[PDB]
Amino acid sequence: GPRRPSVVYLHNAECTGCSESVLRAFEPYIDTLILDTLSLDYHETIMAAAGDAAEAALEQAVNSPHGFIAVVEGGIPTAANGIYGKVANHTMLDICSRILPKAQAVIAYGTCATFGGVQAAKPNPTGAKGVNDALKHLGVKAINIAGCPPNPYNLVGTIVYYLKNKAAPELDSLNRPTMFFGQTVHEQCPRLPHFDAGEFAPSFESEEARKGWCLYELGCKGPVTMNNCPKIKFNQTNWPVDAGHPCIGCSEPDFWDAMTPFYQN
Amino acid sequence: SYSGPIVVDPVTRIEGHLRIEVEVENGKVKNAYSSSTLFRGLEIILKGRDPRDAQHFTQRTCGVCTYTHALASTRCVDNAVGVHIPKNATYIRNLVLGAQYLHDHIVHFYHLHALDFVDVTAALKADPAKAAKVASSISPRKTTAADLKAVQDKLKTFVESGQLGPFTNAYFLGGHPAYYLDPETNLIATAHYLEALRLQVKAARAMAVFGAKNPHTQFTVVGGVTCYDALTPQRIAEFEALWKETKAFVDEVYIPDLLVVAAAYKDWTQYGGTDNFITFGEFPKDEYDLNSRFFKPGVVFKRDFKNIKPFDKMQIEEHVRHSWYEGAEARHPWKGQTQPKYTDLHGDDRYSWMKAPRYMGEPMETGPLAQVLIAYSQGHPKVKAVTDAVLAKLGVGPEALFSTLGRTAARGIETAVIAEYVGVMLQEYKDNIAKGDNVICAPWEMPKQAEGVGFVNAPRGGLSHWIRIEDGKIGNFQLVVPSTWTLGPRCDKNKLSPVEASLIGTPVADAKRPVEILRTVHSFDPCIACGVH
Ligand code: SF4
Ligand code: SF4
Ligand code: F3S
Numbered sequence: 037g038p039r040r041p042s043v044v045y046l047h048n049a050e051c052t053g054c055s056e057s058v059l060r061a062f063e064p065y066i067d068t069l070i071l072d073t074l075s076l077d078y079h080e081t082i083m084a085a086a087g088d089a090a091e092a093a094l095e096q097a098v099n100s101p102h103g104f105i106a107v108v109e110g111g112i113p114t115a116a117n118g119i120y121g122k123v124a125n126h127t128m129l130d131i132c133s134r135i136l137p138k139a140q141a142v143i144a145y146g147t148c149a150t151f152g153g154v155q156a157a158k159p160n161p162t163g164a165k166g167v168n169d170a171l172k173h174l175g176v177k178a179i180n181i182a183g184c185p186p187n188p189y190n191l192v193g194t195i196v197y198y199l200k201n202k203a204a205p206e207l208d209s210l211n212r213p214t215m216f217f218g219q220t221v222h223e224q225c226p227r228l229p230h231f232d233a234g235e236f237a238p239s240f241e242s243e244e245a246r247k248g249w250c251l252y253e254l255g256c257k258g259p260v261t262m263n264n265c266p267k268i269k270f271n272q273t274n275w276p277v278d279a280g281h282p283c284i285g286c287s288e289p290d291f292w293d294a295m296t297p298f299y300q301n
Numbered sequence: 302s303y304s305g306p307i308v309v310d311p312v313t314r315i316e317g318h319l320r321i322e323v324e325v326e327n328g329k330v331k332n333a334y335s336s337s338t339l340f341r342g343l344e345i346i347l348k349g350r351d352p353r354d355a356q357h358f359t360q361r362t363c364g365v366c367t368y369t370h371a372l373a374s375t376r377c378v379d380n381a382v383g384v385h386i387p388k389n390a391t392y393i394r395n396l397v398l399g400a401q402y403l404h405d406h407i408v409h410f411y412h413l414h415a416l417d418f419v420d421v422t423a424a425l426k427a428d429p430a431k432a433a434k435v436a437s438s439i440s441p442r443k444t445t446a447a448d449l450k451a452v453q454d455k456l457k458t459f460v461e462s463g464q465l466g467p468f469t470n471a472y473f474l475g476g477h478p479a480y481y482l483d484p485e486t487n488l489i490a491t492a493h494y495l496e497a498l499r500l501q502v503k504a505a506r507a508m509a510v511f512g513a514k515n516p517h518t519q520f521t522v523v524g525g526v527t528c529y530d531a532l533t534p535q536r537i538a539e540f541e542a543l544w545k546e547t548k549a550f551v552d553e554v555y556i557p558d559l560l561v562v563a564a565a566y567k568d569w570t571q572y573g574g575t576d577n578f579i580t581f582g583e584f585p586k587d588e589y590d591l592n593s594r595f596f597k598p599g600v601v602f603k604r605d606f607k608n609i610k611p612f613d614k615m616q617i618e619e620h621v622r623h624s625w626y627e628g629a630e631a632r633h634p635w636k637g638q639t640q641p642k643y644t645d646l647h648g649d650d651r652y653s654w655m656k657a658p659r660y661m662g663e664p665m666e667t668g669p670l671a672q673v674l675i676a677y678s679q680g681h682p683k684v685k686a687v688t689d690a691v692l693a694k695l696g697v698g699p700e701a702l703f704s705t706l707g708r709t710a711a712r713g714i715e716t717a718v719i720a721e722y723v724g725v726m727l728q729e730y731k732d733n734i735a736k737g738d739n740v741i742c743a744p745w746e747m748p749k750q751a752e753g754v755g756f757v758n759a760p761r762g763g764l765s766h767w768i769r770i771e772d773g774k775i776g777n778f779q780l781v782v783p784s785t786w787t788l789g790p791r792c793d794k795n796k797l798s799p800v801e802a803s804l805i806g807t808p809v810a811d812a813k814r815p816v817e818i819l820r821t822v823h824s825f826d827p828c829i830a831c832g833v834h
């Protein structure tokens with residue numbers, strides 16, 4: 037077959053939920069992605085090599101004359117000269133500073149990588165930053181695919197677009213693809229007619245909640261959140277409001293501080 | 302044979318950022334250190350916030366053991382406010398947790414652990430007809446030569462591209478003296494690794510049916526759950542179909558593979574043992590009584606399973622003397638402190654971002670081996686039946702369980718038992734709905750001052766979240782997580798943690814490719830984002 041494009045997947049300050057979301061890929065599935073579509077050349081969660089052998093695999097991939105795409109999960113801890121996060125006894129800040137400027141393209145995958153995420157919430161003891169913020173001085177401009185975790189549809193769609201067109205798709209002012217992030221959750225929500233009618237559930241136990249009334253009074257952040265959740269859904273089957281729970285705003289910068297308390301509007 | 306240090310950093314095929322250091326003498330490990338190398342500080346971040354918000358933050362402790370921390374935080378706040386959630390909320394929460402166990406353990410065995418035992422490249426040498434006969438002898442599912450040739454053909458194309466991807470620099474490339482499987486068994490395992498990549502999609506989808514999405518579910522609230530659609534016959538049938546398929550894979554694919562690998566690696570009954578075990582129980586009938594759980598809590602010291610001790614939550618203290626936090630004072634988590642202070646590797650004898658939890662001063666293994674051994678010893682009939690059948694198939698005695706192999710087997714045992722029990726819970730839930738109980742959430746009031754604790758036995762063991770509410774806000778919030786118990790460092794009595802102690806005695810055939818260290822470390826299923834938070 038043809039040479040497959042190389043992907044280097046990095047883990048910074050992360051929970052591995054973004055990695056797990058990629059494993060949920062559907063049509064194409066993850067086996068197709070790593071056997072046919074791409075060459076996954078470094079990924080600490082699933083790779084065979086460990087230790088020195090893993091470091092050597094990383095160096096081999098990064099220095100390849102064929103080039104690579106970087107996918108980055110997690111925020112970069114910057115406090116105290118980066119010491120709150122290390123891999124192979126190098127700071128995550130140093131690792132990303134050395135690798136990411138060499139990539140042909142960088143995708144920041146998940147709200148942590150895009151915007152700083154959960155560890156960047158106040159008081160941000162580790163000085164965590166999103167990729168573009170941390171590395172702006174190096175000229176890194178990662179495509180931001182936000183969410184906690186994002187819809188893996190949005191990662192695969194971005195990669196496929198880039199491979200076909202050799203360019204990023206149209207990006208919004210937060211560097212997110214407009215093809216996925218161009219609409220609010222709310223404008224796509226099945227409960228919108230109740231919102232318009234002023235029909236709000238007053239509590240989770242209420243008959244109004246049972247009947248599917250709008251969750252705005254219970255804190256829903258759909259009106260202020262850009263994502264494709266109601267359209268694509270998750271796991272081919274559901275999404276938060278259809279499970280009766282408000283959106284918490286998880287594709288937005290700083291959402292941990294901007295969208296809290298989660299149960300108020 | 303090798304004498305000197307070995308460092309494995311990164312330890313791959315775990316969740317999170319782990320550095321293992323060992324001292325080897327004449328080919329065997331004589332000392333070990335478990336160094337967790339990322340800190341986030343979620344407990345610091347939580348201070349001052351609304352207690353209702355905690356579960357949303359703490360779920361992001363870990364996306365491998367997704368849901369578990371949302372459940373622990375919700376149990377914790379439920380407990381603090383004194384709400385008794387409706388029966389259906391317990392059922393739905395329990396069903397989603399059961400589904401999490403199945404997903405997590407399947408992915409662990411195949412996608413995290415198996416590359417320590419399976420030489421994928423050797424599958425290219427296999428005779429697919431012989432392999433199919435072996436596969437069909439160990440499982441009621443029949444596999445043909447053509448089925449396995451399709452895998453071998455796909456693998457051949459991949460390897461002949463020269464782009465080995467996740468297999469680059471694998472310890473098995475070119476052969477390795479510690480890799481024992483024949484080509485045919487390697488092909489069977491590789492085929493099932495690939496199958497499991499697609500099966501786990503279904504296993505995770507089962508959580509989303511009631512729980513909105515996976516990863517990071519969104520259906521729990523203080524007082525119960527939000528998912529009225531989960532009461533419908535259509536959602537229940539969707540869950541049931543996914544569960545049935547997942548259970549079939551457990552029973553027909555995972556367990557037979559686990560047994561065929563264990564039989565080939567029976568020497569691994571000799572390495573990786575531990576002394577003490579703690580477990581919290583799981584799948585309650587009564588949210589306020591741990592002894593109402595399908596698996597019950599318990600504590601065992603020095604392998605004395607005739608004398609299971611009751612679990613006293615006041616006997617937990619988390620040490621910091623060998624951790625990157627201020628001072629040396631251990632704390633009970635209702636008086637916990639999270640005060641980072643980095644000193645670099647071994648600076649002032651500190652080497653990890655994990656705290657070191659101790660129970661009555663002792664280091665405790667938690668996770669599947671603890672849950673299975675304690676339940677067995679409590680007379681749990683399902684755990685006894687499966688465990689005895691596994692020991693008989695392997696031709697080993699109960700002593701074999703105290704090992705790396707045993708721990709790996711216990712993860713399978715747990716998976717099989719829980720897969721069956723999910724069906725029982727599902728039927729009980731259906732029966733409850735049929736009686737006319739359609740309630741899923743109960744009202745509650747926020748106290749200005751309260752203490753609460755929530756207990757979950759997660760896939761890696763006993764998880765507890767601890768809150769002190771002051772002025773209706775989070776005064777203190779402390780997570781004590783299973784991997785903290787198992788993989789945290791030494792305490793102020795200098796006692797090795799379970800993973801550290803278990804590594805003493807490990808043989809290392811090739812110090813450049815120290816797969817034996819990985820086998821033992823991976824058998825605990827480390828989760829470092831969990832352990833540190
Ligand atoms: S964006 Fe969310 S799911 Fe992804 S690594 Fe961060 S905390 Fe985890
Ligand atoms: S439930 Fe949320 S997203 Fe839906 S209509 Fe109401 S406010 Fe909008
Ligand atoms: S919480 Fe996140 S997953 Fe979608 S529904 Fe709201 S943006």
Ligand SMILES: [Mg+2]
Nearest residue numbers: 779780781834
């Ligand atoms: Mg803690």
